Design a protein around this nucleic acid. Structure first.
Lengths: 81, 94, 95, 91, 92, 92, 96, 81
DNA sequence: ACTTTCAGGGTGGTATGGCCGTAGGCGAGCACAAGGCTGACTTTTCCTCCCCTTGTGCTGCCTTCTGGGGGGGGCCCAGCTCCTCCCCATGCCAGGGTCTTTTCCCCCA
DNA sequence: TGGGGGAAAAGACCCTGGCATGGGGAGGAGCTGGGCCCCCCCCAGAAGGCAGCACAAGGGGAGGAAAAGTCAGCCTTGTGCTCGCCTACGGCCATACCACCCTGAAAGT
């Protein structure tokens, strides 16, 4: 549907920042990080869906996602390859 | 020993798109490298596609998917349209 | 029959036959389809036409007649899509 | 204010679990994929791989953002830091 | 005798040879190329496994887990260089 | 019929850490690592053959591909392990 | 006597309007041969090879200095500093 | 076989900085840009010399340099390829 | 534990690649200015760094409630597999049409 | 005013047409693995609100360190000449790898 970017809640963004090493976080960081995550996900999902449609399938596969990430310079170990 | 390049065809396209503008040798040698880079990019992506799908043939579908994966936005859109038009013209004339 | 060039049959200016030969010799697949050279030549010719039209516009802006690497670099850096496609490429004498 | 931040960094740097909730991440991934193809199915492993990649990407981005923040003599990260980190990275 | 047990390797020389022949890399593949690639792969796997085992021992564990693999990779400088743009699943 | 290096990776773990096991998730990461480095070396050795107009991937091309990809100390040891196997393989 | 800064802006415009090499060729050739000495003794060099190396080096340095200027402006400064270069390199992925 | 990194003079570094849009330059920028240039040149030259040695040649060629640059995601046009 | 594909032994054949010969392009080396560039000095002035203050937003804590996580079951749709065959791609040879190399001279830089 | 690019000529090489042919994949069935959907529940974390405090930002001062101008020297560079060394092509032949048929074993189940 719509309005699911808010599912990446403020506490989740704070946990990710604390994993990064951030000590204090400004209030607009949450919206900026949501926009950034949205852009990254659109890029990866577009590549993965192109890979899926090339196979005449209707299921986005972990292999499709792995190839989409690999063709962006971000190799992912663990889900095959 | 005769070296091969896309200079003749680049010149023909330049004449078609700009009737009177010329081109320097350095610019032609840069255009040849550009054409070779794009060719190698599309060919590598199509080969990876065919290997992922366990296919031994590189076809128009693989080339189109590689173009969609590499070129951005309207560039990819128009390149895909040009490729489809060229393939249709080729196979529609024996 | 008369030897009709496949480039002329497809309506392109790029060498469909040479593209087929490089695809076969390039060790990309065991086999290469009959539409792959026709598609690749069309894509390459479209991109060449776009980049050359922008380079010619850049040269016409500078009151010149002959395209030089500076005009190519100006066209690439001033076109958003071409900048994205070639954003890791260095041009000699391009500035 | 700050000692809990340190004892939160030390906790979420030592653990490996996912930081974002799986159900909203799944819904967001499907919402994004809807603009690319209608009626798409998704493997659970595919969504999980997307989640791991996204979380790793955001953790690296936040590391670079923290570096940008310390560059400007600050401990608070601001959207300018994220924008500078992304511009220097090339995104 | 298997091709691996003529030069003393654990990795499959025959399987690597078939992978190279079927991988669309060149029109021909030599007879020492699979042996060399198997040796290189075996050495790299042995090094990564040894460092990951050291990391697992440091965590009072008898099992290798993605956390230990990521710890070894990020700690070792050369491995950090080689696998620098690589994400490990559930590696912390 | 789905092959993997899971058989051969295990035999190398029992030579460096005989008492340490490996998880199912971590062992699949090991397969994604071996499948990655193999394609890296075979994708650079296939370029060295093309640049020099050679149609054969020999141990000399694999040696150069290892030298171009692996960092300083890893390339010195991986090359030495490779040339020791090829010498032993040729000699009976 | 021009004010401090106008000549700097003139230099910026002039060097962004031109395409020539800003590093003298003989010292760069000497440095390239110096560096290649430790990789292989008695090594010869094509003039085109030295040319390509100089072109790549200058493009890399111009891009790095642009990123350094961004880093300097981030800290509310107009003077680029070694700390700015280090931050730029670390973020792009050359210092880790 | 002597200090040749000092041949990358201060005026050349300022010219490169102003091409990069830098307005004012600190005096410690030169000695650090020299080291950065040295590291980049060492990487590219090591790759080019590895190609030259594989080709059983004694002269490093522009095509070897082009391959070395392409191997780092630094493709260069105008010198072949 | 069983097994089924696939790695290995054996034999022929040729095409890739190593060896030797050879000859020229071009890379190294040495003068020779000379003048444009670089190095060192001086003024100054404007930028950077430190300090102080403030208010503003960030964080820590309590409480409530909501929605995500964990099963339990269904089902049905899409991914994987097997058998046909036929049409597409490959291999080889002849012949010509196109693309490469050499000369120049006049228009754009 | 000069130098290199756009046209012309010879040739050589590889592209296309033609013929024979094995195999890849498109398609038609079947089958079932799991992805989607609904249901219940419950409690862990998200959300909102309040207090307070510490941190970023703005203003002010000082000093120090680049910028700009100047002058003298130096060493880059364009030209000219020589040498000889390496690299690229040619000719020839050996043997290494592919192709294919059988068999047993190993690794995936």
């Amino acid at each position: 549907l719509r309005d699911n970017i808010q599912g990446i809640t403020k506490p989740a963004i704070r946990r990710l920042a604390r994993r990064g090493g951030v000590k204090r976080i400004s209030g607009l960081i949450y919206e900026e990080t949501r926009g950034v995550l949205k852009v990254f996900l659109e890029n990866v999902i577009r590549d993965a869906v192109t890979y899926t449609e090339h196979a005449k399938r209707k299921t986005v596969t972990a292999m499709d996602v792995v190839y989409a990430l690999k063709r962006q310079g971000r190799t992912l170990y663990g889900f095959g390859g | 020993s005769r070296k091969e390049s896309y200079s003749v065809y680049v010149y023909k396209v330049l004449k078609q798109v700009h009737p009177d503008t010329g081109i320097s040798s350095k610019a032609m040698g840069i255009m040849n490298s550009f054409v070779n880079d794009i060719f190698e990019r599309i060919a590598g992506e199509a080969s990876r596609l065919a290997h992922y799908n366990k296919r031994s043939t590189i076809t128009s579908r693989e080339i189109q998917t590689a173009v969609r994966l590499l070129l951005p936005g309207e560039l990819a859109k128009h390149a895909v349209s040009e490729g489809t038009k060229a393939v249709t013209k080729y196979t529609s004339s024996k | 029959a008369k030897a009709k060039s496949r480039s002329s049959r497809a309506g392109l200016q790029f060498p469909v036959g040479r593209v087929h030969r490089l695809l076969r010799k390039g060790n990309y697949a065991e086999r290469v389809g009959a539409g792959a050279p026709v598609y690749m030549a069309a894509v390459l010719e479209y991109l060449t036409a776009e980049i050359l039209e922008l380079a010619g516009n850049a040269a016409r802006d500078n009151k010149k007649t002959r395209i030089i690497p500076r005009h190519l670099q100006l066209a690439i850096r001033n076109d958003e899509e071409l900048n994205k496609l070639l954003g890791k490429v260095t041009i000699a004498q391009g500035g | 204010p700050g000692t809990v931040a340190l004892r939160e960094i030390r906790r979420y740097q030592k653990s490996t679990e996912l930081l974002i909730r799986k159900l909203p991440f799944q819904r967001l991934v499907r919402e994004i994929a809807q603009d690319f193809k209608t009626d798409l199915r998704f493997q659970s492993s595919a969504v999980m791989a997307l989640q791991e990649a996204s979380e790793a990407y955001l953790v690296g981005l936040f590391e670079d953002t923290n570096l940008c923040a310390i560059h400007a003599k600050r401990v608070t990260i601001m959207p300018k830091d994220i924008q500078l980190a992304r511009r220097i990275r090339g995104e």
